[PDB]
C-alpha cells in the first residue's frame, strides 16, 4: 500500500449524454448483450442493398400530378402552376376530417429538414401515341409572391426561363428547375403546427400550351401528362428540425377545446374514497392527501353549476358515480364531491353563500377507478 | 433492539443457489415461485465439484441512508441444506450475530451508491467444494460447500 497523496480531479457531473449528437462520438451505454465487443452482423444475404442517404431518397421520382391535356385547350391555357419547392402537393379526395396528402420522396425527405437548396427535376410523361402532335412551354418564374401569382400568361413566362417541348415521337422530358433565390438555402414551406415560419416557395413552375394539341381522327382528343418530382443532382438539405408531416398509421386527432370539463392532469384515474380532512370524495391514490383536484368552473355571478358525466360507463363505480359537485376544500384546490337533485341543492347551498362545514362512507364498496380521465358535462342552473 | 454491531442478515455464499425460498403460502416470492431456479444452478446442477470465486452485487433499498458493512466469514461450516438460506438474525448469543474484527469487510455508503459489489474468494482447505444439494454426512464435509458466509449489517 503506497499512499496516493496527490490531488484528485475536479469535475462537473451531468445526468445524461447528448441526445443531439450523432456522428463523431463514441457513445457509452449499458448493452443488454452478453459480449462487450459484440455488434450485429450482416451476412451475405442479409446485406444492406440501400444506403440510407438523402441523395438516394431524394433521387427517386414520385408521381405528383396528373394533367388533363385536351384538344380544345387554346394556345395559352394553363395546365399546372405548381410551386418550385420539394413540397409539391397532391391531395387525396377522401372523407377523413384531416386530409391526407401524397408527397414525392424529395418532399418527405425534405420535410424533416429546415432548409433546402438545389435544382429540382420534373419528369413530364406526355402519354401519347406517335400520332399526337403538340407543343408546350414548361417555364419557371423566379420570385413570384401570391399576389403576382395571378396576372400570368405564357407571354410573361417567356421573359423568364422556359422550355418549349415538341411532342412528335418522343413523349417524355425532364425539366430541371433552377434554384434562383437571394438565399443560399431556403426555409421549409410548412413547418410544425405553427402558422408563422411558413415560407412559400422561391419561385413557381408553370406549364402552358404553346401550340395546341392536334390529334388525328383515329386517336383520342385527350392526353394525360404525368408529372414526377425528383431532387436533382444539386439538391441538398441541411438542418434537422421537427418534421412537417405525420404518418397515416394513426389519423386520429383530439381537439382540445376548453368547453368540456375533466380532472386536472395527473389526478386520474380516480375512485370514490374517504378522506380525513373532509363522506366520499374522489381520490387518485391510496395514500393520504391524494385527492383528485378539479379545475374551477367559470360560473357567472347569480347562477350555479352541478355536473353530469357524458358516459356513465367511464365513471368511477362504487352505483357508477355520474354526478359531482366541485368546490374548494380550503387546502388550495377544488375537490369533487360525489352525490346521489342533491347536486342541485348542494350547488344552491355552496354558490348561495354557505360552506362545507354547515349541517345543510358506506357507498364506497369496490372502489373502481374511472376509465382514465373521463369528460364531465357542466350542467348550469340559476340560483 | 439492534445495536450498531448487530448483523441485519446473513447468507451462506455458494454457486449452487440457496435453498429456494418460494415464500409463505399467503405471500410467495413470485420469481422463485414462478421462475424456478434460474441459470447458474441449472448449469451447476450438472456438475459435482467446483473450485472458484463468486461475485455478489448486493442491492440495497434507497429509502435507507445508513452506512452498511459486509463481512466475509470463511470459518463458517454449512450444516445441511436446511438453513442454507438467508437468515434474518435474532438477538445476539454468539459471535455470529455481530460485526467481527479480522474477517474481510467492506462498508458501502448508501448516500453515495446503494450497491456494494464483491468478489468472494475460494478460502477453503479443500481441493474443490460440493455443488449439488447437501445433506452433511461427514462433520468436516460441511466445511466444503459454501465459500464462506456473508453477513450484511446496518450501522
Amino acid at each position: 500500500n503506497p499512499s496516493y497523496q496527490q490531488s484528485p480531479r475536479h469535475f462537473v457531473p451531468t445526468g445524461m449524454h447528448s441526445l443531439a449528437l450523432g456522428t463523431n462520438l463514441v457513445e457509452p451505454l449499458h448493452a443488454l448483450r452478453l459480449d462487450a465487443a459484440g455488434t450485429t452482423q450482416h451476412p451475405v444475404g442479409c446485406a444492406p442493398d440501400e444506403d440510407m442517404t438523402v441523395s438516394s431518397i431524394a433521387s427517386r421520382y414520385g408521381l405528383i400530378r396528373r394533367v388533363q391535356w385536351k384538344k380544345d385547350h387554346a394556345k395559352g391555357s394553363l395546365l399546372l402552376q405548381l410551386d418550385a419547392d420539394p413540397f409539391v402537393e397532391q391531395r387525396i379526395e377522401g372523407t377523413n376530417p384531416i386530409s391526407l396528402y401524397w408527397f414525392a420522396p424529395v418532399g418527405v425527405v425534405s420535410s424533416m429538414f429546415m432548409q433546402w437548396r438545389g435544382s429540382l427535376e420534373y419528369r413530364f410523361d406526355i402519354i401519347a401515341s406517335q400520332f399526337h402532335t403538340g407543343r408546350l412551354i414548361v417555364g419557371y418564374v423566379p420570385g413570384l409572391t401570391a399576389s403576382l401569382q395571378l396576372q400570368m400568361d405564357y407571354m410573361k413566362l417567356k421573359s423568364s426561363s422556359y422550355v418549349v417541348f415538341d411532342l412528335q415521337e418522343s413523349n417524355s422530358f425532364t425539366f430541371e428547375v433552377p434554384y434562383v433565390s437571394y438565399r443560399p438555402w431556403w426555409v421549409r414551406k410548412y413547418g410544425g403546427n405553427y402558422l408563422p415560419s411558413s415560407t412559400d416557395a422561391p419561385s413557381t413552375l408553370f406549364m402552358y400550351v404553346q401550340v395546341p394539341l392536334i390529334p388525328m381522327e383515329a386517336v383520342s382528343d385527350t392526353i394525360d401528362i404525368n408529372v414526377y418530382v425528383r431532387g436533382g443532382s444539386s439538391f441538398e438539405v441541411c438542418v434537422p428540425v421537427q418534421p412537417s408531416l405525420g404518418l397515416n398509421w394513426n389519423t386520429d386527432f383530439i381537439l382540445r377545446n376548453d368547453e368540456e370539463y375533466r380532472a386536472k392532469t395527473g389526478y386520474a384515474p380516480y375512485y370514490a374514497g374517504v378522506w380525513h380532512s373532509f363522506s366520499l370524495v374522489f381520490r387518485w391514490g391510496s395514500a393520504s392527501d391524494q385527492i383528485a383536484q378539479w379545475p374551477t368552473i367559470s360560473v357567472p355571478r347569480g347562477e350555479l353549476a352541478f355536473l353530469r358525466i357524458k358516459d356513465g360507463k367511464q365513471a368511477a363505480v362504487g352505483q357508477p358515480w355520474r354526478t359531482m359537485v366541485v368546490w374548494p376544500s380550503g387546502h388550495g384546490y377544488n375537490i369533487g364531491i360525489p352525490t346521489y337533485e342533491r347536486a342541485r341543492q348542494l350547488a344552491q347551498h355552496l354558490y348561495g353563500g354557505g360552506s362545507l362545514t354547515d349541517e345543510k362512507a358506506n357507498q364506497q364498496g369496490p372502489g373502481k377507478v374511472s376509465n382514465g380521465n373521463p369528460v364531465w358535462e357542466v350542467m348550469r342552473a340559476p340560483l | 433492539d439492534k445495536d450498531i454491531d448487530h448483523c441485519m442478515f446473513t447468507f451462506p455464499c455458494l454457486p449452487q443457489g440457496l435453498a429456494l425460498d418460494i415464500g409463505s403460502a399467503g405471500s410467495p416470492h413470485e420469481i422463485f415461485n414462478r421462475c424456478r431456479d434460474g441459470i447458474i444452478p441449472l448449469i451447476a446442477s450438472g456438475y459435482r465439484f467446483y473450485r472458484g470465486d463468486l461475485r455478489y452485487k448486493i442491492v440495497f433499498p434507497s429509502n435507507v441512508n445508513s452506512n452498511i458493512w459486509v463481512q466475509h466469514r470463511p470459518d463458517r461450516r454449512l450444516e445441511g441444506w436446511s438453513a442454507a438460506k438467508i437468515v434474518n438474525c435474532d438477538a445476539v448469543s454468539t459471535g455470529q450475530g455481530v460485526y467481527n474484527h479480522g474477517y474481510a469487510s467492506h462498508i458501502q455508503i448508501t448516500r453515495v451508491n446503494n450497491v456494494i459489489e464483491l468478489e468472494v474468494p475460494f478460502y477453503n482447505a479443500t481441493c474443490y467444494n460440493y455443488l449439488q444439494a447437501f445433506n452433511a454426512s461427514s462433520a468436516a464435509s460441511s466445511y466444503a460447500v459454501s465459500l464462506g458466509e456473508i453477513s450484511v449489517g446496518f450501522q
Binding site: 444492406p48 440501400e50 427517386r60 391526407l100 396528402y101 405553427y194 408531416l245 | -
Partner: protein, 46 residues
Amino acid sequence: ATSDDIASIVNKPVTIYYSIGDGMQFSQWVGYQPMMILDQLPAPVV
C-alpha cells in the same frame, strides 16, 4: 419498491427515447404512404 413506497410512484411520468445504434440497416426501398400536414391541424379555439 414495496406497497408503501408505491404511492410516490403513482402518476409520475416516465419518458422513453430511442435511436438506432450504429448497426441499423434499413434494407428495401418502399415509397412513403399518404402523409398528413401538421400545420393544417386545427387550433384549440378559445
